Design a protein around this ligand. Structure first.
Ligand SMILES: *[C@@H]1O[C@H](CO)[C@@H](O[C@@H]2O[C@H](CO)[C@@H](O[C@@H]3O[C@H](CO)[C@@H](O)[C@H](O)[C@@H]3O)[C@H](O)[C@H]2NC(C)=O)[C@H](O)[C@H]1NC(C)=O
Lengths: 122, 75, 109, 49, 49, 75
């Protein structure tokens, strides 16, 4: 079957970069999208950016260009997102989802993982 | 690219087929021909220009062919 | 523009309640809307993988479409197990990003 | 300001005289010629006797 | 067999000489042109008195 | 493909500018210019042809300019 492990939740301190790994096996990873939607506690979830594993670059939400970075590897079929700067704002669980490349399918987030959770405090 | 300067005639060819030969063979020619059939107005002016420029049928023919070929390809 | 959907309440007797999604002339009036319902605290699942096409969601009772600038969802025979937050997300083509909504707190009595 | 769409098809139309290779991990570039000066020094026929 | 990508930027390049018509509800064609006649008989000066 | 044959001269005149007036005003000349800078070889051939076909000065210069325009565009 096709699924995303999303590793395990970790929490850190402000001013340091944190990493969220996200592996999806069971299908040809090249053709489909990875969306990295954030979800805050008791708030709506907003999507930030795609990553095409085969040739894609970061296409963040306008709120988040220069705030996050996205990388990937084709051999292991895993997509990496890391937070270059942790303020007090980003206290939420970050997700993964498979997306299609269809114009009507840019929002097609069919499959989701568990959700790696990160919060920041002193 | 802007698809206005195809990577053609570079000389580094091999026995194997190119990316697209069956269509790039006649793409530009068909553009010129559909232009010409759509708009015949330029033909009268081209005929006049070739005719009143110093006329030896070699010169007239080459001027007419070039002038009728350049405007469509390079609009 | 940006989409905003309202939170509302309902009851466990079967009744048609409409989760209306409102957008603009560039985000949802031309593109396929996508409907999500999330059981709270876990990963949301996908409810409608096209404009009016459901992959494997509860059939014959979850159906809806869109009209002009508005998209809507209709649920019938809603029981308690359907307690979920419902999300409408549309792809914005001007800003080259998908436009997720704030969320509906659909509570069923 | 507008972003002027996606130039993908323009590119695919542009490379009208380019050749082809295969991209699978490493790339095996086909469509090339190589001269080789054969050396027939030690070749001997089986079953001559 | 291949797919030859998408012609988005190709079409955007093609429509060089065309105008722009912003359509939000139906269509709102700007960049228009129209001839008019002004029958100006019934124009009070408003300041006679 | 469709990228060729824009309707630049289609004649549906308007007061406001078009979709891409700024680029389209010079893109074709830009293509010719970059083609010439890339490839200087065709200049010698065009000069030779004009010199050995052009009976007069004006015929020679017209032949040269037409040849130097058509080939980069037909590429
Ligand atoms: C490019 O434009 C986007 C919006 O189109 C800008 O996003 C804005 O980012 C700031 C901070 O990242 C947001 O402020 C935040 O607002 C929330 C609202 O609840 C508040 O709780 C936070 O404390 C924070 O102040 C702002 O809302 C957001 N604008 C939106 C979402 O419309 C982005 O900053 C721009 N990039 C630039 C100018 O480089």
């Amino acid at each position: 079957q096709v699924q995303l492990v999303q590793s395990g939740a970790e929490v850190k301190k402000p001013g340091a970069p944190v990493k969220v790994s996200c592996e999806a096996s069971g299908y040809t990873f090249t053709d489909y999208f990875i969306h990295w939607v954030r979800q805050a506690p008791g708030q709506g979830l907003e999507w930030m950016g795609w990553i095409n594993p085969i040739s894609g670059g970061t296409n963040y939400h306008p709120r988040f260009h220069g705030g996050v970075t996205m990388t990937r590897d084709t051999s292991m079929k895993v997509a990496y997102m890391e937070l270059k700067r942790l303020t007090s704002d980003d206290t939420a669980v970050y997700f993964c989802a498979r997306g299609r490349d269809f114009r009507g399918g840019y929002s097609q987030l069919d499959y989701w993982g568990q959700g790696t959770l990160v919060t920041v405090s002193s | 690219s802007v698809a206005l300067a195809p990577h053609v005639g570079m000389g580094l060819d091999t026995r194997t087929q190119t990316w697209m030969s069956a269509e790039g063979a006649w793409r530009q020619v068909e553009k010129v021909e559909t232009w010409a059939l759509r708009h015949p107005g330029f033909t009268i002016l081209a005929l006049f220009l070739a005719h009143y420029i110093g006329t030896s049928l070699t010169q007239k023919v080459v001027i007419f062919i070039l002038l009728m070929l350049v405007t469509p390809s390079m609009t | 523009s940006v989409l905003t959907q309202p939170p509302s309440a309902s009851g466990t007797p079967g009744q048609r309640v409409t989760i209306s999604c409102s957008g603009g002339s560039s985000n949802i009036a031309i593109n396929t809307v996508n409907w999500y319902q999330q059981v709270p605290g876990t990963a949301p699942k996908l409810l409608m993988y096209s404009n009016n096409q459901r992959p494997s969601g509860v059939p014959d009772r979850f159906s809806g479409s869109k009209s002009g600038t508005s998209a809507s969802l209709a649920i019938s025979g809603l029981q308690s197990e359907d307690e979920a937050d419902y999300y409408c997300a549309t792809w914005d083509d001007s800003l080259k990003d998908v436009l997720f909504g704030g969320g509906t707190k659909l509570t069923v009595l | 300001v507008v972003v002027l769409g996606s130039q993908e098809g323009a590119m695919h139309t542009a490379l009208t005289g380019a050749t082809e290779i295969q991209n699978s991990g490493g790339t095996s570039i086909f469509a090339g010629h190589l001269k080789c000066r054969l050396k027939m020094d030690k070749l001997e026929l089986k079953g001559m006797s």
